[PDB]
Design a protein around this ligand. Structure first.
Ligand SMILES: [Zn+2]
Ligand SMILES: [Zn+2]
Lengths: 127, 214, 25, 91, 51, 81, 97, 97
RNA sequence: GGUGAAAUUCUUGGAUUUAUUGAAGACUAACUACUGCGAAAGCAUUUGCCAAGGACGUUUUCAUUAAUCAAGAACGAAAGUUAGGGGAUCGAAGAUGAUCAGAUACCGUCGUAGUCUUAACCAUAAACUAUGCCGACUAGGGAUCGGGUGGUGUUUAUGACCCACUCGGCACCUUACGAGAAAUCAAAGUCUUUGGGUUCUGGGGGGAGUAUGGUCGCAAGGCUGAAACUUAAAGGAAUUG
């Protein structure tokens, strides 16, 4: 009935972007980003930019003929900050607002059995 | 400037008949053309789905299953088992402090000529009329229950060929087998498998595969 | 009455000042 | 008695060829002249004939190990990973 | 035949064309590593002692 | 409290404590009567047992050792000796 | 001189256990030094669960959550976490409220 | 286990050492419970187990090699085989398979 | 890409992202605590082998076999040295673009030794059980680890938990009658109402842990270790601006 896709929303610091693709994962559909909107290099992860990218991505999905999505939220992971970026909530909210069915939400931020020590040295980023 | 939305073609995956309702989505793959088109060359696209809406259930966001496409026919391509897993919601909901954590892992050779790895996760709890805060174990009971769990989880396999092993797994019979197998230590406890994965699929097995068609 | 917490860090952690006519000019 | 203090086997070369060189040569010459043991002899009997060619004089055969040692770390690692991959292919 | 071996295998005296009877990695202590396979148009990717 | 009859302190106070800390240290072990279920012999045995005790003739089993007290495991005979 | 009874951290006959890194600055520290704070709230903004329910089926199906524990350092802990009162006598507090 | 087991054997019962004596005992039929090493040659191994089949005895493949077999028997030399020709005070030859 | 702001850098030769498959070496998250073990340094994946060890139970055994130590030896984080192997990430040097004017600051990127291991070497070092070692005593309360004892015990007639006692241990709260300069301490107490036994350290600060000698190390330095001359104070706890 309702044809699925996967959103693959990846949010971090100084960027966030959506990568809609098929259920298999090897045939993308309209990878778009919030960094394409405003060329400031300081608000690349903003809610307004993420919402603009969300409108563009939902437009591509509706024009292609997709109706349902599974959202997957990603951060830098591994050793990095591990937190979801700020724009992901605005992105998925615009996706819901765009009249697209959404189901089976989960987080896929990678997590190790720890290794590969973080940068910054022992003392860290001494700002 | 190709505009490949018009170029690509729609296919419907089809889960095997060792399952409930098996129509489980559609894919936009590529153009079915001449000069070595890829529609009859993909043969390996893997899809991640939920057992719950696979069966029509409505209250299990966990125990997701993945399936690989094996062959294509009639623009309607049949899949086969590739592995299973849990969602990080339930696992990290179950995990908390002031309790312990048991893990076991077997790498078993089944009846048909497959080998696959299987996991087994468990925790602990507190009996009634309790006063204690934490309820940790003795670190020898842990080895004992790990031993009996690995024994049971290699006993079910090597015997219970993969096709029916999935059908015995999806009702979660093995968990409630362990719960009343080691009832002497704990009448009820929260056990799960949490992971299965194949390594060495030897041969396509078109015969049995088309026997389990849907 | 232990006093081992004053026994790891803050006197020598490179013993080339103890082997000082080796590498440092 | 204990004749030499530091040079050991390399006293034949004498006072010459440096010292950092004729300690490396010592390191390798103890190895190439030492005896080792084959499990299929059971005993410490193997000895070098030439570079890469060692001989178990019990069990009466030859093996093609390293130049100054009967086996190398690289050889052992490849033996282990082949034991791994053969077991993986057959299972 | 180095198409019928797994990845990461370690070999020597490998042929560069099938029939040359041994070209590469036949010096003392030298080998050659299997990086990847390519069953279609059959080939294999391989790493030599010079990197 | 802190002043009592140290000539003979109370029973509940002298029983609950460890054996060495008593005014006069004494044992908490004993012997007992035990009957082989197979044979007839009602022999004696230590309470805090050790390596496997069995009957003299119909040697099958009497009591299995543990960290503290042993266990006859079926209700045969355990009173005194 | 004498600031704290448990001077650095919770080390009673252990010598040396293991280090970890700070999340903010990634300073290598011991494990139980400053604070290891929990993070379980949700994956949910200003709620919008009405939006999710109308844009879902079997509405929202999970109430899914994030789960982590994060090890701060005092160079970053008091700077980010603000508790607003560190007296002498209230150095022995244990209840967050 | 096997080591204290055949230690009890050399204490109480009767054994014999080496390929020649073992073969003589197997031929006489006064033998049972042949233990062989691991590093023994395959030819000797094969003919030994063939004679063992002909005589209806029990073969045990010592997971260790030669020196450790000698030490387990208690002797200060390499020994490839043993034949337990009597275990009058033992539970070895019946319990081991 | 990365930041508070940047650039240095990569990329339509298809970067970034996405799905499968593989290799490398490294590490063992969450569980992880007022938890445990070890003489210390220190020790968290599974199983197996090798030996080891504390506590508990004991109506087993030996009968002073013991406590502490010069000297002489064992072990001894990390960083370093020798030769090899390996070298995924981080990264002392070093190159790079930018900010408080510049950065040889901080910062972003890259990156050599190193970070892993094999056989040796170095062995003093901000390594407090918040306090050398062994023995008796002196307040209360609770939690908890390993045993040991019993129960109307509770739970499918010990199976799994609770209650009470007890030995040993890591810790916590109160109060100190005692002590202390105070912080504070159940030991830092049982000390001028001064003595249970044993080992090592210091007599103002600097000069000085430097000279000189010995000895050790792969190394005009480890370990041991002065003086000339000096100022009148340095130093510890606690109060107040
Ligand atoms: Zn041999
Ligand atoms: Zn940090």
């Amino acid at each position: 009935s309702q044809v699925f896709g996967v959103a693959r929303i990846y949010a971090s610091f100084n960027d966030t972007f959506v990568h809609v693709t098929d259920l298999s994962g090897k045939e993308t559909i309209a990878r778009v980003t919030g960094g394409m909107k405003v060329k400031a290099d300081r608000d690349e992860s903003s809610p307004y930019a993420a919402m603009l990218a969300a409108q563009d991505v939902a437009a591509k999905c509706k024009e292609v003929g997709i109706t349902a999505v599974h959202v997957k939220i990603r951060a830098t992971g591994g050793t990095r900050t591990k937190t979801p970026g700020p724009g992901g909530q605005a992105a998925l909210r615009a996706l819901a607002r765009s009249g697209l069915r959404i189901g089976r939400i989960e987080d896929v931020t990678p997590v190790p059995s720890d290794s590969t020590r973080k940068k910054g040295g022992r003392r860290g980023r001494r700002l | 400037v190709v505009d490949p939305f018009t170029r690509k073609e729609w296919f419907d995956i089809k889960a095997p008949s060792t399952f409930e309702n098996r129509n489980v989505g559609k894919t936009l793959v590529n153009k079915s053309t001449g000069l070595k088109s890829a529609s009859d060359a993909l043969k390996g696209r893997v899809v991640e789905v939920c057992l719950a809406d696979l069966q029509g259930s409505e209250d299990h966001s966990f125990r997701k299953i993945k399936l690989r496409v094996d062959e294509v026919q009639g623009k309607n391509l049949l899949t086969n088992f590739h592995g299973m897993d849990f969602t990080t919601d339930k696992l990290r909901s179950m995990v908390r402090k002031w309790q312990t954590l048991i893990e076991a892992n077997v790498t078993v050779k089944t009846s048909d000529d497959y080998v696959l790895r299987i996991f087994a996760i468990a925790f602990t709890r507190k009996q009634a009329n309790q006063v204690k805060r934490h309820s940790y174990a003795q670190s020898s009971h842990i080895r004992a229950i790990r031993k009996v769990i690995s024994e049971i989880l290699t006993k079910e396999v090597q015997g219970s060929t993969l096709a029916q092993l999935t059908s015995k797994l999806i009702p979660e019979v093995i968990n409630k087998e362990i719960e009343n197998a080691t009832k002497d230590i704990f009448p009820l406890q929260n056990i799960h498998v949490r992971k299965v994965k194949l390594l060495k699929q030897p041969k396509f097995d078109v015969g049995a595969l088309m026997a389990l068609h849907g | 009455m232990r006093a081992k917490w004053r026994k790891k860090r803050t006197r020598r952690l490179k013993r080339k000042r103890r082997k000082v006519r080796a590498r440092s000019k | 008695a204990k004749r030499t203090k530091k040079v050991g086997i390399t006293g034949k070369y004498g006072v010459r060829y440096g010292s950092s060189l004729r300690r490396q040569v010592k390191k390798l010459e103890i190895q190439q002249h030492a005896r080792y043991d084959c499990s299929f002899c059971g005993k410490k009997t193997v000895k070098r004939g030439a570079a890469g060619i060692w001989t178990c004089s019990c069990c009466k055969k030859t093996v093609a190990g390293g130049a100054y040692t009967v086996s190398t770390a690289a050889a052992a690692t490849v033996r282990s990973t082949i034991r791994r991959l053969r077991e993986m292919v057959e299972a | 035949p180095l198409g019928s071996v797994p990845e990461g295998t370690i070999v020597s005296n490998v042929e560069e064309k099938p029939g040359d009877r041994g070209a590469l990695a036949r010096a003392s202590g030298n080998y050659v590593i299997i990086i990847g396979h390519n069953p279609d148009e059959n080939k294999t990717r391989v790493r030599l002692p010079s990197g | 409290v802190l002043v009592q009859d140290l000539l003979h302190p109370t029973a509940a106070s002298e029983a609950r404590k460890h054996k060495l800390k008593t005014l006069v240290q004494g044992p908490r072990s004993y012997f007992l009567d035990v009957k082989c279920p197979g044979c007839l012999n009602i022999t004696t045995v230590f309470s805090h047992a050790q390596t496997a005790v069995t009957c003299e003739s119909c040697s099958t089993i009497l009591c299995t050792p543990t960290g503290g007290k042993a266990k006859l495991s079926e209700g045969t005979s355990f009173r005194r000796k | 001189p004498k600031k704290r009874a448990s001077n650095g951290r919770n080390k009673k006959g252990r010598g040396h256990v293991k280090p970890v890194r700070c999340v903010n600055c990634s300073k290598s520290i011991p494990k139980d030094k400053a604070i290891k704070r929990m993070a379980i709230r949700n994956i949910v903004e200003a709620a919008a669960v009405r939006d999710l329910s109308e844009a879902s089926v079997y509405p929202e199906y999970a109430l899914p959550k994030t789960y982590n524990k994060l090890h701060y350092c005092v160079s970053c802990a008091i700077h980010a976490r603000i508790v607003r009162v560190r007296s002498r006598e209230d150095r022995k507090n244990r209840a967050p409220p | 286990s096997i080591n204290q087991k055949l230690a009890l054997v050399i204490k109480s019962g009767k054994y014999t050492l080496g390929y020649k004596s073992t073969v003589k005992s197997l031929r006489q039929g006064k033998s049972k419970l042949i233990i062989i090493a691991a590093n023994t040659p395959v030819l000797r191994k094969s003919e030994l187990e063939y004679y063992a089949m002909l005589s209806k005895t029990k073969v045990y493949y010592f997971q260790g090699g030669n020196n450790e077999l000698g030490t387990a028997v208690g002797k200060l030399f390499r020994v490839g085989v043993v034949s337990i020709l009597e275990a009058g005070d033992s539970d070895i030859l019946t319990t081991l398979a």
